[PDB]
Design a protein around this ligand. Sequence first.
Ligand SMILES: N#Cc1cc(Cl)cc(Oc2c(Br)ccc(CC(=O)Nc3ccc(S(N)(=O)=O)cc3Cl)c2F)c1
Lengths: 556, 416
Amino acid sequence: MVPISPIETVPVKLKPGMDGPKVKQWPLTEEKIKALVEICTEMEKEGKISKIGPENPYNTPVFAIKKKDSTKWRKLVDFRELNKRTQDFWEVQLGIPHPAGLKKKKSVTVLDVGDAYFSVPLDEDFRKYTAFTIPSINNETPGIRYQYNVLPQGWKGSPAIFQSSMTKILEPFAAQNPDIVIYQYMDDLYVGSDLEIGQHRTKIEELRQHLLRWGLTTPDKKHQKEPPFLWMGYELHPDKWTVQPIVLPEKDSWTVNDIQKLVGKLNWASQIYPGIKVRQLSKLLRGTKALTEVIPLTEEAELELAENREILKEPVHGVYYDPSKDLIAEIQKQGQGQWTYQIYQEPFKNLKTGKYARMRGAHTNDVKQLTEAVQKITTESIVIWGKTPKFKLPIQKETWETWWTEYWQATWIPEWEFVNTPPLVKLWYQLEKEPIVGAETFYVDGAANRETKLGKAGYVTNKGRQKVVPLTNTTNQKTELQAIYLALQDSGLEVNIVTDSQYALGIIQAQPDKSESELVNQIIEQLIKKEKVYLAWVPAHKGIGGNEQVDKLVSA
Amino acid sequence: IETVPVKLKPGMDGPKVKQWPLTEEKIKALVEICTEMEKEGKISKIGPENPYNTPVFAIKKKDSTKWRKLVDFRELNKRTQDFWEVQLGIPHPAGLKKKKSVTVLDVGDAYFSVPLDEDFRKYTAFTIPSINNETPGIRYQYNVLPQGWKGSPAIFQSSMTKILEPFKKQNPDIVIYQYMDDLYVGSDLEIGQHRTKIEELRQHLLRWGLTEPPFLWMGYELHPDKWTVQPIVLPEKDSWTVNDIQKLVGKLNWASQIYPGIKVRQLSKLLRGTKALTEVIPLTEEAELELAENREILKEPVHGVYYDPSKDLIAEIQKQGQGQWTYQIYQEPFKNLKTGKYARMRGAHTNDVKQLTEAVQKITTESIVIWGKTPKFKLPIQKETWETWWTEYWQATWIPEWEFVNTPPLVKLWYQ
Ligand SMILES: N#Cc1cc(Cl)cc(Oc2c(Br)ccc(CC(=O)Nc3ccc(S(N)(=O)=O)cc3Cl)c2F)c1
């Protein structure tokens, strides 16, 4: 006997007040019970479970399931109840590594410690709670009772307790081997080094020895799975990575769950396959969860797909990260609130790619959207590489400067450069800071009758120009915008406009370049054509005249 | 040597707050800092049986060049039992805000000499994250009282009292006040002397030091009688255009929500016609008196304005451009308890977010001195921009609460 170090146990407890489970054992066939009694004997003969007396009042049901064309049963304990009564554990597996974050190594070895999983003891005080019963044949003897001595499959704590225990064991090895990397992911170990493959299979051998100190062995026949490793929907190669094959269903009829599949799988592909678009397809999942409803495509969704399948036609690869080279992120405007980006270190070799969609809003602009996509890519990059990339952005230095200095919010983007790849993000209009000398002054007003939806919009100007248009199916807000629209329509290239509408100032002072309101868009389209607009606000109901000489004409 | 029984409130659990992403250099700083605190017993590794998390990050305090660990204990603080047991509180020193000068001292390291309840320790849990989730997070809990926890000053209060009495009875004009990791020292002196009285107050703490702290040698300088609330002021002109009078009526109408007998009828009278915005209007005699009257009214106090320690302080900030920022602190709209401006915001001449972040710190400091509590900010910024960047420019050991303004105020002007 060579003394193996024991794995220190993790103190466990049930929720505050909740007791253990008492679930009735399910009645089983004679065939099945025999199968369990054999397995539970082999398990007992290994140290994993133990027979208990009748005082233990705790029952977790047990089942036998047959492996597909294996005249051989396997044992399933339904812990779903004990889990609900078990305390919370810290979960670190929230996030998984991104392949573009990995630094390339000459040699990588994957070891699965498949045995070692049960090698980890359960908390002595907690075992009693894992009690299950093998019912006897014909129910004529009391069923054989068992408790676990090790972490069970299907238990709340096993993921977390397994990792804490593997980490604690690896600490000294990593510490005293700085020239290698070990990545722990659930039941697996991935081991990499930039060493000659002599010095490398040596260090791997040492790690098998070091794992033996805690009585753990790894495969002699060296793991059948060798490059490319197929992991969490990715493909890892010695020199590059990509996603596992993305094949898009060709079909005659496209249904609901068959678009809650086309989104997920197109989003997955978008991390390496540049310029995937999901907007016209996510448009269809709006509201209705009737999971078998054939929804017709749009004529925008058949040309967005003939783009998808031509991007998904030939494979593309991402490279791995080189900390000594610069990190670059480049953004393109795709249209309809859609943005696409590539992160790279060398021209044409992308670490990874992705997309950003416009946030749901009434009104928006391109510069706000670009700002949001920069922040998304900044955070993503902090997560994957521990740093902010230098940005290349389709916006002029002068445009950005005009924007941030005149914008009422605080805004910032990190270090970036202009890249001249149309279409360029630009400012479509700029409101004057002062009234314009020699430009006509339009005093505008609108109002609507709350009961009839009937209203009026118009203006009186300093030159005696006047208009009142009668409207139906309207509101105060709509009439206030229309008044402003009529002044814009009917004035020269320079114009002063006086409104009492706090609503219209709110929208125009947020500098939309695009709107869901067709009336706001028409205002935007006139603002684009003007040489100079000055918008002045005055309070309502002070008979500010032209706001009084036109509140009495539009409320008539 | 022996701890103090601490608990959470009624049916509230310990904090379970997601740790946010950190740059490689802030991860490196926290690994070196935490590895040393562990050797000195201040912290200990924990296992997965602890489900609690509080966020952690790394700053550089004002003028230093060495990283500091900051724990965002906002959530533990909300959930931490109120410490009223012996004393109904620290009845806020109303004197501190009247002093010519106030120096702010980081006495935070003091706390690390006093141990924490054994039961409570699990609630101080935090995680040093890894890049790309490559290794599991390095998990830690506090053994001693943590910087930034509300309980730390409350527990150390008795100890702080016994370290001060000598100086407080040596110098009875000095005002001394403790918020979080910070000591605030006010006087009615001239500076050279004030600076002396500070250096002396270090020789006390260095002497209780052995019975080299890293950030204990720093000193911040305020002037709270050289603070001013701001009157509303109207232009004085010889020539008024229609536009000038439209803006005056706008500001007077707004001011009318704060002040009683502000009248715009006679100035509105001037605006009746459809005149060109740049055309000069002679004021009528009724208009000139109404304006004179409104001025008189604005040179008085707001009526019925009082602090209420039961209610939230709310702080609003407007971006005025050219590095200038306006603010107001109230509890009831139109009842301002302080208003202010900032023009000079530090070495950030092309960075709006660094400027907002310094303004929030300065406003929070003022708020500590006046009412001994932090206000709820309304920031003129998108959440995602603010939450990406604030931690890059943050220098204080407390963190206030904030929300986001998404609609541009008309009012910006009325304070411009
Ligand atoms: N399964 C799996 C898996 C998952 C992760 Cl997140 C990492 C991993 O191993 C590594 C490690 Br550890 C470090 C770097 C990479 C990327 C890399 O350099 N890969 C690589 C490097 C070398 C070889 S070779 N020459 O041993 O066949 C094979 C491969 Cl896939 C890896 F793929 C393996």
